[PDB]
Symmetry: C2
Subunit: 49 residues, 2 copies
């Protein structure tokens, strides 16, 4: 490449990262800040197990 | 000014410094990177006093 600070757009260097990840194949182990709550029973509730 | 990294030449910021010299009126105190020599006399020589 010929990266020079005087070059116009379409020639300046860009930094690129691609994120790939499997939806589900096993016990998942990568995810963010969801607060693990307690456990309730014998009631109609919604859950995010 | 509207300096943006996407701006083309003729709009990116430039840094400028100007140096002005007075042409000597007193014992000078800003000399070049020269080294002095011993003093001779009674001989045809050239000098840089």
């Amino acid at each position: 490449y010929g990266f020079q600070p005087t070059n116009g757009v379409g020639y300046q260097p860009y930094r690129v990262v691609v994120l790939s990840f499997e939806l589900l194949h096993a016990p998942a182990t990568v995810c963010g800040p969801k607060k693990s709550t307690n456990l309730v029973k014998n009631k109609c509730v919604n859950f995010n197990f």
